[PDB]
Structure 1
Amino acid sequence: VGDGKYGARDADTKIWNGMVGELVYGKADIAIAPLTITLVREEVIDFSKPFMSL
């Protein structure tokens, strides 16, 4: 990852910063990390079924 953060919706820039940005802007091809799944991501990126509980 470029800068050590999963990424979130930026305040009123509406930019996707962080690691999510590497896929939203097409910079990278696939992600594999511990990465919490929630509505704000499911709008813009898909997910598989989850591979682990916590």
Structure 2
Amino acid sequence: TIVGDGKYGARDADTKIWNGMVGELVYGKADIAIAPLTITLVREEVID
């Protein structure tokens, strides 16, 4: 499946929501993401 918004996604500053493909792994709309997902700190604490 292709993520709809076309973003890798980062945490919004105010609403604290995730968009994009990490928004599908945290919120459970998909089970795994084999994609160019750059290892950072803000993405380590929400998905492994």
Answer whether TM exceeds 0.5 for this pair: yes
Percent identity between matched residues is 100
Larger Rg: 1
Unmatched segments (≥5 aa) in structure 1: 47-54
Unmatched segments (≥5 aa) in structure 2: none
Higher relative contact order structure (alpha carbons within 8 Å, sequence separation ≥ 6): 2
How many residue pairs align between the two structures? 46
Q: Which structure has the highest helix share of the two?
A: 1
TM-score, length-scaled by structure 1: 0.79
In the TM superposition, what is the alpha-carbon distance from 1:35 to its structure 2 partner?
Answer: 1.1
CA RMSD for the aligned pairs?
Answer: 0.7
TM-score, length-scaled by structure 2: 0.88
Q: Which structure has the highest strand share of the two?
A: 1
Distance in 1 separating the partners of 2:36 and 2:20 = 14
